[PDB]
Amino acid sequence: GDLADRFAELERRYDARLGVYVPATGTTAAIEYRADERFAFCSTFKAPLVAAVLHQNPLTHLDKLITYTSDDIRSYSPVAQQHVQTGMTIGQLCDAAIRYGDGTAANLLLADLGGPGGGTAAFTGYLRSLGDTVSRLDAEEPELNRDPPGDERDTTTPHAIALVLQQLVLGNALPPDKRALLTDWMARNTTGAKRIRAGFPADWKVIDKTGTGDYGRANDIAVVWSPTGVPYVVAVMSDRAGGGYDAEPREALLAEAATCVAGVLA
């Protein structure tokens, strides 16, 4: 009752909708708040996207050169903008997608996974293969960040995306080598310093992938480890849709939600 009341007060104070999921462990109950409501992925999908591309190919595929054109840049792409003439390798694209949320990098990874027409379906199908039957990606960048409130397109749920990230980082969806690549890129992003990371004490390890979008959308998905190595998965999702498409996202809402979780888990 206490935690639900705390999350409700966060919603009132930030004029926001908040979703939280933390899976159960052997000694802890699941934490859930709007955990089965749909929220836009925004860039959070880039973490399982990189997993999908790692999964389907040998490590040498990281060195495959991808060519692309200025026409492919229709989203914030601070890395891919600099390399149009030369192309980028798959590994470089993964790094860019995770560490900067480069949009074009994600689009090219989608096309590596499923071809130019089939990538969003292929990505969704990777989630299906991990037993996520809820989430859906229907558009690529930048449109996936812009669907109207209430539209199911390009959404996941805190519950669904937490269980996916759990399998990728704590489970064996990936072999150890590939899993370590994903976790290393996530451990090296910092877009997420002011989100879940800011709610956990410094002696807890945190790896994360953020997402930000229209309608004040701000998300973060993370795996955390206690100072003695005990892991938890934390998905926090939010929007401020009442302010319209240009509503300001509130990173501090996510930090506060994470602080609430950390207090329960400590």
Author numbering: 27 to 57, 59 to 83, 86 to 145, 145A, 145B, 145C, 145D, 146 to 238, ...
What does the paper say about this structure?
The residue at position 105, known as “gatekeeper” (Feiler et al., 2013), is in most class A β‐lactamases an amino acid with an aromatic side chain, which yields high activity against penicillin‐like β‐lactams (Doucet et al., 2004; Judge et al., 2023; Papp‐Wallace et al., 2010). The mutation S130G leads to the loss of activity for β‐lactam antibiotics and to slower inactivation of the enzyme by clavulanic acid (Egesborg et al., 2015).
The double conformation of the 127–130 backbone loop, harboring the mutation site, could be modeled in both chains, whereas loops containing the residues 213–216 and 86–91 could be modeled in two orientations only in one of the chains (respectively). The side chains of numerous other residues were also modeled in double conformations, including Ser70 and Tyr105. The comparison between the crystal structures of BlaC wild‐type and I105Y‐S130G revealed two differences in the active site. First, the substitution of Ile to Tyr at position 105 considerably widens access to the active site, due to the orientation of the Tyr side chain, which resembles the conformation found in the TEM‐1 enzyme (Strynadka et al., 1992). Second, in the place of the missing Ser130 side chain in BlaC I105Y‐S130G, an acetate ion is present, suggesting possible anion‐assisted substrate hydrolysis. The overall configuration looks similar to that of the wild‐type, with the acetate molecule occupying the position of the missing Ser130 side chain and engaging in H‐bonding with Ser70, Lys73, and Lys234. Our kinetic data indicate that acetate ions could potentially also take over this role, as the 4‐fold increase in acetate concentration augmented I105Y‐S130G activity by 64%. The enzyme either exhibits dynamic behavior on a faster timescale (ns−1) or the observed double conformations are present only in the crystals, for example, induced by the moderately low pH in the crystallization buffer (pH 4.5).
